[PDB]
């Protein structure tokens, strides 16, 4: 048939039955039908209306679900620490110095009748294929993720058993997917006011609970074969056709962080933990990944809580409540990396803060057409 590009917004289908999922989206019947077509079409991950619609819906969900209180307008030892360490359960390790949440929500975009969502099924798709041979038609898409974070990506469903790098053709913005074979997962736990067996305040057999003196200290521990995944990422970067550096030398590639004085979103672990938004320091994590000798190489990161954040989509800041009392736990699967790669004499991978590029990765192969 004959199809044309259209800018008509779609309707979302979800399985979660929360307030935003029921109000803004339809229930999902898992009608994932895919028809392969022997046609050639142009697909762009960044110049896509479905990616912008998903970013706007994610921002609307983030605004409506976790309501901030104030909305602002511009007017040498290597100590690998697991979850069973003695300092872990008491929350007293050597950390950083002092400076309603939505649940498991995942949706799909279903096209209206008279419309289709052509999907590029190319294996070498780097986010921009002007001539994609494998075009697959689908009325309803696959099952995307609404988690918002910098430096990484969690609970994504596009983490295949390989590494592929999305590269924008006009700048150095890069999206890198992870390998699911290495089982790359993280664990984060904040111990709160630790209590004892009940009060027992008496003449004999008297106890004392351990109140957490640092509510602004949390610890995420990071698991998986990350040296092998780091080598796979460097090999895919050296094998990328847009790589201007030395393709036969992966040692000229070096992972990096943004310098001090920049935004805290691009320099720290701007991620959510059950309504409380962490700010961790991956300097020890960067020393562990890059094997920088003579420095502190840890498999964890001291996380600092912050009542204020910055708006990733719009211009402004959001101020939230003080953190509640109790134990805070988070668990997800690391699926993608958001970073900027500069090519030269020494290739530098600077971690970016483009939260929208995760959803641009998730909906980049799909493209709405009008039948």
């Amino acid at each position: 048939p004959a199809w044309r590009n259209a800018s008509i917004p779609l309707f979302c289908a979800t399985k979660n039955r929360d307030t935003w999922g029921t109000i803004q989206c339809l229930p999902d019947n898992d009608d994932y039908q895919e028809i392969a077509l022997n046609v050639t079409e142009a697909f762009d991950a960044w110049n896509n209306t479905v990616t912008e619609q998903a970013v706007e819906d994610v921002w609307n969900l983030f605004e409506t679900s976790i309501k901030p209180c104030v909305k602002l307008t511009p007017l040498q030892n290597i100590t690998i620490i697991n979850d069973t360490s003695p300092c872990v359960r008491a929350d007293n390790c050597t950390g950083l110095k002092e400076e309603h949440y939505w649940d498991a929500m995942r949706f799909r975009y279903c096209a209206p009748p008279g419309f289709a969502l052509l999907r590029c099924n190319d294996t070498n798709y780097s986010g921009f294929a002007p001539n994609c041979s494998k075009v697959v038609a689908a009325t309803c898409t696959r099952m995307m993720e609404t988690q918002s974070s910098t430096w990484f990506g969690f609970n994504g469903t596009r983490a295949e058993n390989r590494t592929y790098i999305y590269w924008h053709g006009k700048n150095n913005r890069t999206i890198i997917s992870l390998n699911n074979f290495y089982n790359l997962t993280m664990h984060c736990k904040r111990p709160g006011n630790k209590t004892v067996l009940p009060i027992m305040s008496g003449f004999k057999f008297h106890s004392k609970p351990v109140i957490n003196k640092k509510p602004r200290q949390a610890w995420c521990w990071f698991k998986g074969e990350w040296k092998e995944a780091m080598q796979e990422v460097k090999e895919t970067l050296a094998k990328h056709p847009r790589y201007k550096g030395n393709r036969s030398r992966t040692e000229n590639i070096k992972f990096k962080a943004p310098g001090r004085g920049s935004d805290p979103e691009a320099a720290y672990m701007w991620t959510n933990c059950r309504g409380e938004f962490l700010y961790c320091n991956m300097t020890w994590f960067l020393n562990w990944v890059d094997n920088r000798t003579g420095q502190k190489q840890r498999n964890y990161a001291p996380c600092h809580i912050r009542q204020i954040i910055n708006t990733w989509h719009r211009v402004g800041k959001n101020v939230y409540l003080p953190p509640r009392e109790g134990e805070l736990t988070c668990n997800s699967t690391v699926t993608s990396i958001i970073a900027n790669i500069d090519t030269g004499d020494q290739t530098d991978i600077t971690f970016s803060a483009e939260v929208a590029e995760l959803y641009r990765l998730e909906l980049g192969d799909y493209k709405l057409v009008e039948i």
Binding site: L197, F203, K208, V210
Partner: protein, 281 residues
């Protein structure tokens, strides 16, 4: 550090009820013998026999509830709330009251030897009425916190009951009050009257006809030596409890092991009156 873990050693759980059983047996035998030879046959001659009779009756109401503590030290308390309310109130009234008569005997002896001439009526007055109006009813006045704060608790398949205060500040101030009633105020009282009677007997070396005070000072010193490690123990527990000294879990556990041990060796003050009557000195 996770928490504070409470655990009693198994050697206390077998040696300790052995101690309560032997203390119970000799206490009930000796106090029943003393009561049935004094308060029923009227064999009283001196004035201290009424005081030691009061000590013996408070003793026997302690011993008649002692096997409840003996079965508490090995097994869970499956009697009821009111039963251990009763055992707690009778324990504190015995422990306070015995201190009051054990100071009253020294007060009578101070009024006897120093004021030998002009004291015939008032020694008889404390023999009849002043002990009843100033020993038992103050001791009964110091039971109503136990009458309001003692309760039972189920802490992990183990029924224990204790005077359960709302917070640790109540516990630390009540252990402090336990010192200032058990040791301190009768201590300076008994040291003052014994220093005065010794300094006056040093002026009275001309006669040695009255030597019945040797049993009194022997009872005083043995009572204080029996109760001193317990008071030092609860003072150490009081000092760690108000976080003036911090050492960790092992110090509190060592303190609890030692404090049950000096409960065992400080319950020996029951069999002090009958052995001293069996020796006459």
């Amino acid at each position: 550090e996770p928490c504070f873990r409470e655990e009693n050693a198994n050697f206390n759980k077998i040696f300790l009820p052995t101690i309560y059983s032997i203390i119970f047996l000799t206490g009930i035998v000796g106090n029943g013998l003393v009561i049935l030879v004094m308060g029923y046959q009227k064999k009283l001659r001196s004035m201290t026999d009424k005081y030691r009779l009061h000590l013996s009756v408070a003793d026997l109401l302690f011993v008649i509830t002692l096997p409840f503590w003996a079965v508490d030290a090995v097994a869970n308390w499956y009697f009821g709330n009111f039963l251990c309310k009763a055992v707690h109130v009778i324990y504190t009234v015995n422990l306070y009251s015995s201190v009051l008569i054990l100071a009253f005997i020294s007060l009578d002896r101070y009024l006897a030897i120093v004021h030998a001439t002009n004291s015939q009526r008032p020694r008889k007055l404390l023999a009849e009425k002043v002990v009843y109006v100033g020993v038992w009813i103050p001791a009964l006045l110091l039971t109503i916190p136990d009458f309001i704060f003692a309760n039972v608790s189920e802490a992990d398949d183990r029924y224990i009951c204790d005077r359960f205060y709302p917070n640790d500040l109540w516990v630390v101030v009540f252990q402090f009050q336990h010192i200032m009633v058990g040791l301190i105020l009768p201590g300076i009282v008994i040291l003052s009257c014994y220093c005065i009677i010794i300094s006056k007997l040093s002026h009275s070396k001309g006669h040695q006809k009255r030597k019945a005070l040797k049993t009194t000072v022997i009872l005083i010193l043995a009572f204080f030596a029996c109760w001193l490690p317990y008071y030092i123990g609860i003072s150490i527990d009081s000092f760690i409890l108000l976080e003036i000294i911090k050492q960790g879990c092992e110090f509190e556990n060592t303190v609890h092991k030692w404090i049950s041990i000096t409960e065992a060796l400080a319950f020996f003050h029951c069999c002090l009156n009958p052995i001293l009557y069996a020796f006459l000195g």
